[PDB]
Design a binder for this molecule. Structure first.
Ligand SMILES: CN1CNS(=O)(=O)c2ccc(CCc3ccc4c(c3)N(C)CNS4(=O)=O)cc21
Ligand SMILES: N[C@@H](CCC(=O)O)C(=O)O
Ligand SMILES: N[C@@H](CCC(=O)O)C(=O)O
Ligand SMILES: [Cl-]
Ligand SMILES: [Zn+2]
Ligand SMILES: [Zn+2]
Ligand SMILES: [Zn+2]
Ligand SMILES: [Zn+2]
Ligand SMILES: [Zn+2]
Ligand SMILES: [Zn+2]
Ligand SMILES: [Zn+2]
Ligand SMILES: [Zn+2]
Ligand SMILES: [Zn+2]
Ligand SMILES: [Zn+2]
Ligand SMILES: [Zn+2]
Ligand SMILES: [Zn+2]
Ligand SMILES: [Zn+2]
Ligand SMILES: [Zn+2]
Ligand SMILES: [Zn+2]
Lengths: 263, 262
């Protein structure tokens, strides 16, 4: 039938999507800015659709409740038909690929360690062999699931600690984890994706640091409900923009051109 | 219908697929070893099929002839039905995605610069601003197409030089490019994927070096003919192997555990 406006689900996560300082004087898609706002405009132009950005109602990425088997977050909005596409830093994972479709990745990343500068930690092994410094992850995301499922000795030891730590070492948002690092005088380290870690490293007050190599290698993809007619075009659009260098330009724009910790 | 042995097309490219030292007394899949031989075995086990490794007839990855529009290499073997799956360091690209299916990537890479140690080159910009040191790429692959299509000033300038340089700066195989670097006393630099560059850096005689950052960011995928019934399972198998750490284990096995340069 007639063309319909595509409902995009996304998440308030810097620098991917944020509200403009003057958002109350703006309308619709113009209220937002960031890497994924820029990417959404390009995907829509190349695939030939109009769209509406919406922020995921529960503020989560997406996980399946073991008891109810209900998906939450952006994944849930696609699974239950509340959104037509997700354009966000949404990690491609096996369990998600079983229930939604993903484009080829638009950004590479791996799990990484964020410390407050001066913390005597250089690696995941370092974290796993000590107890003075607490550490945790985001809730309802792919990093928590990585540790929950890992059979690698170091990462399983970390999970055994994190799942039982009291008070909870897990946080509701990336911003909460960063704030916990910054206020803990070196006694909390945060496990988060290298993309978000590298962004925060270039933000005032310039007191955090990414240390060690990444723990895994994966990517973010644009997600659609399984079998959606948009998937083929969106996948080709990602590859076209990748090959033309747009994805590299956008990363530089939102990570480094606007960095606050020097050149 | 009944299960059929899956025909795998792949390519002799170290350390992905190589003939074993004792290959002349071996038969079938046992003749070969490497990262992609191990990966094929894992994919087959998780997807539940038997398979036969075959080396692509023309020794190429795959490009489309501009005049006839016919695909060569492994891509062609999939397009024309000569193979059921390609398990190789085959780069995911737009033009290929139009004619074959790719899994999610099993390895990350980008285009990179290989020099003979001591060559006064640190970047693509350095190459583009001089003429004493020649440089080129593999034929019939994704790196040549990258330069052919780039509108980035430095890379467009490099393509203008490469497309007309005499003698030809292009090579038919990665091994020919590496040999050209090693024998040119620093007057040839080779543009190739970072995976292959980093492998060669750890091989005797330890006289090459990867320099500069990568020029792009992309990945290798397992490829199937469009609409093949194997595609969905193979894609999930790649993600499972990724999440289990198996892909990382295999890279360490074939790049670094037996590196020869310390
Ligand atoms: C940014 N970009 C443009 N798109 S593309 O040419 O398809 C492409 C392919 C691969 C990567 C390297 C980073 C990565 C992303 C995703 C995964 C990985 C590894 N591996 C290694 C396991 N598989 S995965 O899909 O989680 C980046 C990339
Ligand atoms: N990108 C992650 C969220 C961040 C994290 O888990 O570290 C996801 O899609 O679940
Ligand atoms: N991996 C490349 C071949 C190597 C190259 O072009 O540098 C391809 O799939 O074409
Ligand atoms: Cl058979
Ligand atoms: Zn506000
Ligand atoms: Zn209002
Ligand atoms: Zn565009
Ligand atoms: Zn929504
Ligand atoms: Zn240590
Ligand atoms: Zn103390
Ligand atoms: Zn355990
Ligand atoms: Zn202090
Ligand atoms: Zn600030
Ligand atoms: Zn760093
Ligand atoms: Zn296995
Ligand atoms: Zn040109
Ligand atoms: Zn000399
Ligand atoms: Zn040798
Ligand atoms: Zn190096």
């Amino acid at each position: 039938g007639a063309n319909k406006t595509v409902v995009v689900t996304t998440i308030l996560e810097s620098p991917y999507v944020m509200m403009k300082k003057n958002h109350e004087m703006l309308e619709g898609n113009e209220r937002y800015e960031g890497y994924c706002v820029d990417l959404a405009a390009e995907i829509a132009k190349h695939c030939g659709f109009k769209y509406k950005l919406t922020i995921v109602g529960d503020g989560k990425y997406g996980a399946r409740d073991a008891d109810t088997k209900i998906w939450n977050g952006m994944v849930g909005e696609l699974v239950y038909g509340k959104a037509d596409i997700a354009i966000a830093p949404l990690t491609i994972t096996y369990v998600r690929e079983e229930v939604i479709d993903f484009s080829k990745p638009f950004m590479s990343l791996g799990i990484s360690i964020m410390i407050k500068k001066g913390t005597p930690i250089e690696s995941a092994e370092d974290l796993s062999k000590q107890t003075e410094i607490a550490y945790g992850t985001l809730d309802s995301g792919s990093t928590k699931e990585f540790f929950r499922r890992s059979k690698i000795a170091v990462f399983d030891k970390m999970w055994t600690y994190m799942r039982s730590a009291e008070p909870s070492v897990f946080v509701r948002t990336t911003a909460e984890g960063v704030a916990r690092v910054r206020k803990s005088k070196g006694k909390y380290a945060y496990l988060l994706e290298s993309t978000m870690n590298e962004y925060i490293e270039q933000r005032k007050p310039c007191d955090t640091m990414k240390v060690g190599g990444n723990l895994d290698s994966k990517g973010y993809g644009i997600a659609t409900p399984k079998g959606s007619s948009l998937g083929n075009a969106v996948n080709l659009a990602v590859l076209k923009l990748s090959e033309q260098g747009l994805l590299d330009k956008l990363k530089n724009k939102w990570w480094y051109d606007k960095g606050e910790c020097g050149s």
